Amino acid sequence: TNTSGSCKGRCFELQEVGPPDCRCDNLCKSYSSCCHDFDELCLKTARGWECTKDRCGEVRNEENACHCSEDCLSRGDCCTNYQVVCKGESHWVDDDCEEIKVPECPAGFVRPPLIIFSVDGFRASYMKKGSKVMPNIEKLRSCGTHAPYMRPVYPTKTFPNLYTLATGLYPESHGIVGNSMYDPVFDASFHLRGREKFNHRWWGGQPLWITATKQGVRAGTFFWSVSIPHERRILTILQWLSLPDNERPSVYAFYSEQPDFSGHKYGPFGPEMTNPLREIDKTVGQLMDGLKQLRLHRCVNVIFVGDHGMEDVTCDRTEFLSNYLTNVDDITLVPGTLGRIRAKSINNSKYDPKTIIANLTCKKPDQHFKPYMKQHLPKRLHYANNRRIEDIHLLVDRRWHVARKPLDCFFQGDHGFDNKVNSMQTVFVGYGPTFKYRTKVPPFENIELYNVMCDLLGLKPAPNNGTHGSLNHLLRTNTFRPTMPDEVSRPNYPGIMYLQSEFDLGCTCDDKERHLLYGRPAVLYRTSYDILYHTDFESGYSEIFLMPLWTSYTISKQAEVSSIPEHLTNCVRPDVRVSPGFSQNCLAYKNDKQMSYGFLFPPYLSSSPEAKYDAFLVTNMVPMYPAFKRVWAYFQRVLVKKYASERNGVNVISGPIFDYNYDGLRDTEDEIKQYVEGSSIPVPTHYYSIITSCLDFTQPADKCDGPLSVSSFILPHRPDNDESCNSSEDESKWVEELMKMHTARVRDIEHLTGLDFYRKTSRSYSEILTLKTYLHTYE
Numbered sequence: 001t002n003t004s005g006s007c008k009g010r011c012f013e014l015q016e017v018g019p020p021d022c023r024c025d026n027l028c029k030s031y032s033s034c035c036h037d038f039d040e041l042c043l044k045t046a047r048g049w050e051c052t053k054d055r056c057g058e059v060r061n062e063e064n065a066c067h068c069s070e071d072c073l074s075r076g077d078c079c080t081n082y083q084v085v086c087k088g089e090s091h092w093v094d095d096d097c098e099e100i101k102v103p104e105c106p107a108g109f110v111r112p113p114l115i116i117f118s119v120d121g122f123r124a125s126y127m128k129k130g131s132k133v134m135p136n137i138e139k140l141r142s143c144g145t146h147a148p149y150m151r152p153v154y155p156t157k158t159f160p161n162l163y164t165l166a167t168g169l170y171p172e173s174h175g176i177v178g179n180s181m182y183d184p185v186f187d188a189s190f191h192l193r194g195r196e197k198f199n200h201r202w203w204g205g206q207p208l209w210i211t212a213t214k215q216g217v218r219a220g221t222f223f224w225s226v227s228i229p230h231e232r233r234i235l236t237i238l239q240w241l242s243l244p245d246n247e248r249p250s251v252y253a254f255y256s257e258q259p260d261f262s263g264h265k266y267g268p269f270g271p272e273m274t275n276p277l278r279e280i281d282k283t284v285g286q287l288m289d290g291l292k293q294l295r296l297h298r299c300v301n302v303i304f305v306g307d308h309g310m311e312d313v314t315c316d317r318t319e320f321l322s323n324y325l326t327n328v329d330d331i332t333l334v335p336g337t338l339g340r341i342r343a344k345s346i347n348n349s350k351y352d353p354k355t356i357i358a359n360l361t362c363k364k365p366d367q368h369f370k371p372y373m374k375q376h377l378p379k380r381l382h383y384a385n386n387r388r389i390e391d392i393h394l395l396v397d398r399r400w401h402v403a404r405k406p407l408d409c410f411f412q413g414d415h416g417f418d419n420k421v422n423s424m425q426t427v428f429v430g431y432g433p434t435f436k437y438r439t440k441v442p443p444f445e446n447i448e449l450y451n452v453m454c455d456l457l458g459l460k461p462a463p464n465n466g467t468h469g470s471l472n473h474l475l476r477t478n479t480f481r482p483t484m485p486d487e488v489s490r491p492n493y494p495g496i497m498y499l500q501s502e503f504d505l506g507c508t509c510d511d512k513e514r515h516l517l518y519g520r521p522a523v524l525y526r527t528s529y530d531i532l533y534h535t536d537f538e539s540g541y542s543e544i545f546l547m548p549l550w551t552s553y554t555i556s557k558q559a560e561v562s563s564i565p566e567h568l569t570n571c572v573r574p575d576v577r578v579s580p581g582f583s584q585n586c587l588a589y590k591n592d593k594q595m596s597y598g599f600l601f602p603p604y605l606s607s608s609p610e611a612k613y614d615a616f617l618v619t620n621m622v623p624m625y626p627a628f629k630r631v632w633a634y635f636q637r638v639l640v641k642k643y644a645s646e647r648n649g650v651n652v653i654s655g656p657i658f659d660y661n662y663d664g665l666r667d668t669e670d671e672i673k674q675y676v677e678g679s680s681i682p683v684p685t686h687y688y689s690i691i692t693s694c695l696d697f698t699q700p701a702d703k704c705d706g707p708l709s710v711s712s713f714i715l716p717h718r719p720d721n722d723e724s725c726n727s728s729e730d731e732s733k734w735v736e737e738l739m740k741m742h743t744a745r746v747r748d749i750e751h752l753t754g755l756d757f758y759r760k761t762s763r764s765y766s767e768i769l770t771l772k773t774y775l776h777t778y779e
């Protein structure tokens with residue numbers, strides 16, 4: 001810890017120095033390890049950040065913050081407006097857009113550098129609403145590649161999102177699950193302010209700067225000390241870009257605390273928000289003028305990205321737990337835009353999580369939060385598989401806060417809500433030689449950017465949650481060539497091999513090209529399964545799970561909906577293609593006083609009364625709680641036809657999911673913790689459906705030319721409907737709302753089932769990857 005060393009010729013050095021030697025890098029202040037003369041040498045402020053006519057051609061002065069002398073360009077330390085003020089050049093923003101067909105890099109550069117320009121709390125709508133006061137940002141957006149919005153991860157907080165951006169991982173995977181955290185194993189607490197956040201034990205996965213370095217690509221600093229002004233951060237980046245070939249980094253990051261800091265105080269659209277936006281734009285202009293005078297403005301790839309948005313949240317819109325609970329002082333609450341509940345540690349044996357959940361469940365007619373046990377949270381959130389995530393979670397309504405008591409105005413804005421909320425959406429602009437020219441791309445999730453960033457730098461990405469190749473349509477070149485995964489298990493195609501009389505399943509029945517549009521799903525794990533054909537549907541029957549892994553069927557715009565005849569209500573027929581030993585039985589359901597069953601292919605949509613008998617095959621049967629049957633029957637009887645009629649037919653792929661450890665991955669048979677009473681029949685934790693049709697709705701789903709359109713859900717298989725506060729009413733008043741909350745990507749279903757969809761289409765694989773990452777938000 002020898003502070004007696006000097007920073008002379010070491011200001012913002014890139015090589016990290018360990019003890020005893022003192023540091024001169026930007027993180028030295030944060031770790032309290034700077035050399036005595038760091039602030040004096042490295043953080044000059046004299047005469048500001050802009051050149052003036054009088055300073056042009058000046059004699060170099062060490063005291064100045066930046067220089068206006070003739071040697072400044074070669075030294076890489078001019079003020080960013082030098083050539084404009086002194087050499088009569090124009091500002092980058094005043095030039096017309098010229099396509100960058102190839103990188104125009106100075107000799108010596110191996111690849112175009114990447115500059116990640118990150119802005120905190122920069123909401124998607126600021127692009128259009130603030131465009132008139134942001135001309136530099138408007139030029140980047142209009143002449144580069146932009147998305148109308150980028151979806152952040154849940155929680156829509158800073159640390160979980162910036163760390164997702166760096167790693168391509170969900171917060172539950174990288175460990176930064178919140179701005180405030182408590183690890184029970186460490187018995188320590190992570191906070192926005194404190195020295196505990198500096199410990200490396202909290203930060204999982206592999207961030208971009210580590211990915212780069214491990215592959216021999218030099219990485220600049222991503223985290224900046226708060227005391228370093230934005231102008232100095234920009235000048236430091238430009239100085240590093242002026243270094244010799246063998247020392248020059250290829251990846252850089254800038255960070256701005258704004259517009260977030262002002263957003264919290266004045267709300268997202270507070271009149272006070274114009275100044276911070278003008279400021280961020282001025283900083284962009286400085287970077288761009290700075291790159292132009294270094295002849296790098298047509299060589300560097302720039303990413304303008306946000307971490308989350310900002311909502312209108314006041315203290316009048318606060319919900320108090322003291323209005324629901326008796327023991328509010330006996331609980332710890334992570335409050336605000338989300339809620340995480342923990343018991344207070346000492347002499348609190350009467351603490352019951354079930355009582356806290358029951359007392360927070362549908363108590364006020366206009367209640368502005370909903371409690372959940374973390375494993376019951378919508379799967380799309382990926383917010384469960386981490387010990388730092390408390391079991392009790394409160395999903396708070398947009399514009400609302402949760403607090404313990406009136407004890408605990410100042411703020412007009414906040415963020416942290418569900419990542420599907422409009423106000424939480426952020427920005428994405430890609431500008432440079434590798435991005436497309438004047439191109440708009442569809443919205444995407446920030447988990448996807450890490451792979452793009454690796455691709456832009458020629459790196460092999462570490463394993464992450466992005467879908468590599470899903471964002472190829474953003475790039476002019478340097479595209480990753482994705483390949484479909486190899487199918488592990490081949491299917492069996494059984495014929496009639498069993499006699500009806502061989503089946504003693506305790507079942508009774510008064511029975512005396514079109515449906516698989518995109519090829520069969522590929523099974524990517526080792527298992528035994530049969531493909532079963534029928535007039536109205538096709539399935540992939542699992543011998544181990546004793547039910548289909550998938551069921552595929554097409555419903556045309558004009559399909560007729562029929563009812564289950566009175567005499568077929570309890571009909572279950574044996575399937576002569578599957579062994580009685582590899583079949584389910586009715587006696588297990590009769591003996592399970594809490595479990596009933598349902599069917600994957602809906603009997604309501606049979607093409608004829610004769611065809612309807614196939615829907616009652618024991619091989620189309622799945623276990624279902626009576627409460628869930630209310631949801632499933634309404635989906636099958638009413639909603640599938642509604643979608644077919646609205647989308648000009650639909651192709652449906654339904655099936656079970658098993659995720660007992662809530663890690664978002666397919667369970668192995670040993671991970672299943674519930675079976676139908678005294679049977680080998682596993683109980684699914686969820687049920688899915690993938691509903692596909694033609695993007696061009698003038699074309700029927702079964703005769704589609706061009707892109708596809710999809711919507712999917714992962715419904716929780718619950719023994720009650722406590723999640724839905726109106727569940728006592730008719731299903732037409734609550735089932736659809738439930739389903740919209742549990743909307744999913746095809747990719748989320750793929751991880752949970754070990755299946756690979758859309759293997760046989762007329763579309764490019766890159767386009768199919770984009771389709772698999774699509775989330776239908778209803779927002």
Ligand SMILES: *[C@@H]1O[C@H](CO)[C@@H](O[C@@H]2O[C@H](CO)[C@@H](O[C@@H]3O[C@H](CO[C@H]4O[C@H](CO[C@H]5O[C@H](CO)[C@@H](O)[C@H](O)[C@@H]5O[C@H]5O[C@H](CO)[C@@H](O)[C@H](O)[C@@H]5O)[C@@H](O)[C@H](O[C@H]5O[C@H](CO)[C@@H](O)[C@H](O)[C@@H]5O[C@H]5O[C@H](CO)[C@@H](O)[C@H](O)[C@@H]5O)[C@@H]4O)[C@@H](O)[C@H](O[C@H]4O[C@H](CO)[C@@H](O)[C@H](O)[C@@H]4O)[C@@H]3O)[C@H](O)[C@H]2NC(C)=O)[C@H](O)[C@H]1NC(C)=O
Nearest residue numbers: 172173174175204205206385386387462463464465664751
């Ligand atoms: C989102 O994408 C994620 C990434 O792919 C998916 O998460 C992965 O899931 C799998 C399966 O669950 C899991 O695999 C297991 O790994 C076990 C060992 O785990 C430790 O090591 C890995 C790898 O470390 C390497 O990488 C890191 C940087 O990322 C580096 O620091 C290491 O030094 C090491 O380097 C080597 O690789 C890198 C490239 O990655 C090279 O650059 C380098 O040169 C080296 O070659 C770590 O990632 C794990 O990290 C977890 O734990 C630490 C400490 O607690 C946390 O800080 C960290 O945040 C992370 O925590 C999260 O995951 C754990 C589970 O791992 C959760 O419990 C937790 O709640 C968090 O969610 C570990 O330190 C291995 O034993 C195991 O083996 C089993 O299966 C095999 C069959 O293959 C059997 O033979 C065995 O008997 C075992 O049963 C298995 O391979 C990955 O570890 C996990 N990765 C991460 C980052 O979480 C995720 O599923 C996906 N999400 C969805 C929904 O799809």
Ligand SMILES: CC(=O)N1CCc2nc(NC3Cc4ccccc4C3)ncc2C1
Nearest residue numbers: 116118162165166222223224253254255
């Ligand atoms: C002052 C303040 O609120 N914080 C929290 C976030 C932060 N982030 C960065 N760099 C970021 C980290 C990162 C991660 C990915 C991509 C770009 C960047 C720049 N630097 C400092 C700070 C400090």
Ligand SMILES: *[C@@H]1O[C@H](CO)[C@@H](O)[C@H](O)[C@H]1NC(C)=O
Nearest residue numbers: 324325326327352355356359
């Ligand atoms: C739950 O509500 C009941 C009835 O209002 C009350 O008796 C009980 O103490 C409450 N429990 C908690 C833990 O808040």
Ligand SMILES: [Cl-]
Nearest residue numbers: 178179180334
């Ligand atoms: Cl938090």
Ligand SMILES: [Zn+2]
Nearest residue numbers: 120121158307
């Ligand atoms: Zn933030």
Ligand SMILES: [Zn+2]
Nearest residue numbers: 121260264415
């Ligand atoms: Zn904030």
Ligand SMILES: [Zn+2]
Nearest residue numbers: 659665666667
């Ligand atoms: Zn699992």
